[PDB]
A paper describes a structure:
Bacterial HSS is mostly found in α-proteobacteria and in some β- and γ-proteobacteria, including pathogenic strains such as Legionella pneumophila, Brucella spp. and various P. aeruginosa strains, including PA7 and PA14. It catalyzes the conversion of two molecules of putrescine (PUT; 1,4-diaminobutane) into one molecule of sym-homospermidine [HSP; bis(4-aminobutyl)amine] as the main reaction along with several side reactions. Bacterial HSS is NAD+-dependent, active at neutral to basic pH with an optimum at pH ∼8.8, and shows increased activity in the presence of 50 mM potassium ion. BvHSS forms a dimer, with each subunit containing a boot-shaped substrate-binding pocket between an NAD(P)-binding Rossmann-like domain and an HSS-like domain. The cofactor NAD+ is bound as a prosthetic group in the binding pocket with its nicotinamide ring being part of the active site.
Krossa and coworkers identified three binding sites for the amino groups of reaction components within the substrate-binding pocket. Assuming the amino groups of the reaction components to be protonated at neutral to slightly basic pH, the ‘innermost’ N atoms of PUT (N1) and of HSP (N01) mainly bind via a salt bridge to Glu210 and, in addition, via a hydrogen bond to Asn162 at the ‘inner amino site’. Following a similar approach to probe the role of BvHSS residue Glu210, the E210A, E210Q and E210K variants were examined and were found to be inactive. Superimposition of the variant structures onto the wild-type structure revealed nearly identical locations of all residues in the binding pocket, including the wild-type and variant residues Glu210 and Gln210. These findings convincingly demonstrate the indispensable need for a negative charge at position 210 to stabilize the positively charged amino groups of the reaction component at the ‘inner amino site’.
Author numbering:
A (entry chain B), B (entry chain A): 3 to 476
Amino acid sequence: DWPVYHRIDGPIVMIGFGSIGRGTLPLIERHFAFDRSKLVVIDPSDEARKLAEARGVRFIQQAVTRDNYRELLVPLLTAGPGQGFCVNLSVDTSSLDIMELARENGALYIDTVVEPWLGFYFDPDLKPEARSNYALRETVLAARRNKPGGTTAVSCCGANPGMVSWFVKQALVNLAADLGVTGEEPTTREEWARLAMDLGVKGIHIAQRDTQRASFPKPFDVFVNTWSVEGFVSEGLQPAELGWGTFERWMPDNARGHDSGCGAGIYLLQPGANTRVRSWTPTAMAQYGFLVTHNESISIADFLTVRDAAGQAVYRPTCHYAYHPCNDAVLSLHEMFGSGKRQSDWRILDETEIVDGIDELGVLLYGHGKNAYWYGSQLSIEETRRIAPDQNATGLQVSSAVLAGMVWALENPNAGIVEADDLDFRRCLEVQTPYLGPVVGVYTDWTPLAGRPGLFPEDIDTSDPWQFRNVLVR
Amino acid sequence: DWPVYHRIDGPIVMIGFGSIGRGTLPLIERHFAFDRSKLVVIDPSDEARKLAEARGVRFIQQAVTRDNYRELLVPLLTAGPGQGFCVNLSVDTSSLDIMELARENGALYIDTVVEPWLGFYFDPDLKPEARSNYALRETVLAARRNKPGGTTAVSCCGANPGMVSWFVKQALVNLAADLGVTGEEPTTREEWARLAMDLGVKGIHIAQRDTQRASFPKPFDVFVNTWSVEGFVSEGLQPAELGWGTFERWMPDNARGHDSGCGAGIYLLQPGANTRVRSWTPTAMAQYGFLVTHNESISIADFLTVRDAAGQAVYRPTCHYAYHPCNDAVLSLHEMFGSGKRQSDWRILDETEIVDGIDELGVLLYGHGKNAYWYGSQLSIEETRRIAPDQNATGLQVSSAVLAGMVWALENPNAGIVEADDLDFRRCLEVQTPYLGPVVGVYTDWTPLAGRPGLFPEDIDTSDPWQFRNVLVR
Ligand SMILES: NC(=O)c1ccc[n+]([C@@H]2O[C@H](COP(=O)([O-])OP(=O)(O)OC[C@H]3O[C@@H](n4cnc5c(N)ncnc54)[C@H](O)[C@@H]3O)[C@@H](O)[C@H]2O)c1
Ligand SMILES: NC(=O)c1ccc[n+]([C@@H]2O[C@H](COP(=O)([O-])OP(=O)(O)OC[C@H]3O[C@@H](n4cnc5c(N)ncnc54)[C@H](O)[C@@H]3O)[C@@H](O)[C@H]2O)c1
Ligand SMILES: N=C(N)NCCCCN
Ligand SMILES: N=C(N)NCCCCN
């Protein structure tokens, strides 16, 4: 007896049927009312076709490209009788162009990433700045400025980016309550930003530890991951990137800012998946994470910015990813960066291939009076198998966030282009929480200066343990 | 059947009965003639005691310390009737002090590391220079100058240091043939150095890839290795260290030299096991190694130094370790450095736990006319189990080098303090080769600049691919 949240009165066009599409389709079928023949999946892969045929769903074996996307998607999204929903879970497609097409035709839209057309991430004529998620996000912000309001389109609503924006709001509320600060929670963006400022939040890690492991050892010259290998390598080869807090007093020599845009970001002239940061999760305790670029690194810092009358930022948290992937992915990164090139083969771990483990994913708020607070999900593979098919624990955190964004978009269908920071976080977490396993908040007295300095000289700032100077591995 | 090289008539005193002692004792029993009652094993651990008793060998459950080593060891070393052999395969004991005791009492000596007394590797008042293997080795060189000749003591005769010195000589021979350099095979240190210089060898990696893996996955908060965890962690937390070649044109800002000594070394003010270098082996192809300090990095560069009349070095190869350990040790390093402290538990993989894999261990000579040449052993666990008990492939490469060193010392018992570079490499390899599996030379066109510059600006030296500037990972 699962809740059916809404009737969808139009076509459901799912672009992409890899690990996330495969975990999202059963949730869509479970939680929305629609005639089954309204749903069609689009993916160029033979593997995806065979799985879709086995699930009995309509399947169009085609790559969506700049040359064909209008021809293909417009008729599919406007088949009627009412408003359709474009669920974009693909690689190599332009989120912006597909979102703008959906909106022009009155269809709802959701995705989990601001993705460019094939050919972008490895174009040699591009500067590192132009390869940054800040630059991609700015194309979406400009599209919203050019066409405000209109049909709801939800950008970057997966686990991270996505759910972690809701966790930040919940964590801020909890931090205030744990101090005895009572009174209504924020309702506006400015109020959220000021809550973070008033609590003294210096920054936020998206602090993740994947402990899922397979029944076979990592094969030589095979990249192994629990979600998209292509997508992980793409973002891992983008510049390291972070939302940049007002409290930071140091940045590396190879860090750069941006001439234009929301003002919240810096990037480093080095690949994020080969950049390490010191961080912490409840199961990992102190660990290395990789400083992989993510939309929410910028979007959360932007959302939580307090400006003065003249428009300059007076407060902004640091925000970035601190990702410890599954052990086989750690080894895959060591192998890829060590060989200088991508492995000849790759595979994504299926739930049938996973022996145990969890995907621990939350937000680590630091610098406040209780030093650091981690809030998020500790979903295990064992629980995943019991509550949702066709995915591992990493996949279910993502697919259930897409579900929640879809509920929100159907309930708020005239909201325009929105990010996860713009949604009603309580409504979204109400939809998502049945799929998140243990959701817990944990304080720690760990800081990045724990145990330091050691037996070698280090450049550290002992007056401010959470300075990026102390977090970055150098 | 197996050759019995010599009769040993005196006591055989084995200090330490861990992974290497366990592998070396059966080879000693196989290849030397002696009454088993003349063996004596000294180790503080109960695990060692149970193993020794199972072998029916005399056992003393003591830790050898600065306070007790003269009182404990002299009666054992001088028990007669003949000359004794002290086989030191321990941790936390002073190689130098035990070696000098053995020589003072007419006993032969062999070890696989210049180890200091307990307390040194983590004394907070030691400057980084004093923690280097260069400095430890200089204490051995000083002892030789103080007491030339005398009873043979073989310093650092394992797989690496040890065997790889013999691989360097064989590789120089092979390169000379292949490049058409004419001349007699060297027979003195000065002739070997001149051969390296005439061949244009800019440098040498001790290039190693361990692919052994266990039937169980890496446990959380357990350091896993194929040999000493204590020993590996100790050397991994010493400064990164290398023999410094005359061709190098750049050193990092945190590199330092030495005021005194043989002059062949630099060290970096960072731990070697968290320092990566670009390297290459036949099985791994291009890979990261860790720049872990090792005696042979100095000893080989020193041995192959050519000087002019003024005693100034005019040629010297760069030489250093480029270690890719087994996958579980790679994960163990990521865990240890990421948490800032040693794991609470550790284990050494036993042959009964290893499912497959090899220990590929060789020397990569580079900068000559055929770019780079790797020469070494590709010993598999399957072959190891066929030919020797109680050890894995890593251990067998070490124990068989100790065996070769012992045979050499018996045939040359009044040669004074010697390193592996000073032994007759052909006799040593004649004893060792039955235990090395495939031993092969391979050329490659790979260089550290393959694929570079990439998508981000890099500080590289395009005039000479093999510069340390291009090898070191920043
Ligand atoms: N939390 C998050 O926000 C989050 C998490 C995971 C993944 N993602 C993103 O979601 C997307 C999918 O992840 P995944 O794990 O399912 O990836 P995946 O690699 O498993 O699958 C991607 C699918 O896209 C298909 N595809 C490729 N080119 C296409 C085209 N032109 N048109 C249509 N389909 C095409 C592929 O055939 C493949 O099946 C990725 O972009 C990834 O970066 C976001
Ligand atoms: N190729 C090489 O040159 C090479 C390779 C492997 C190991 N090694 C060195 O050989 C040594 C042994 O390696 P391992 O793998 O056998 O190590 P291990 O950790 O397995 O064993 C070390 C043994 O020494 C014993 N020990 C500790 N303190 C002692 C003391 N005070 N007196 C006597 N014994 C003591 C321990 O109880 C243990 O059994 C280490 O020093 C290691 O660095 C060299
Ligand atoms: N989320 C922000 N950064 N700003 C608020 C944008 C609100 C869009 N309706
Ligand atoms: N190996 C050296 N570096 N020098 C040679 C010294 C000879 C010792 N009997």
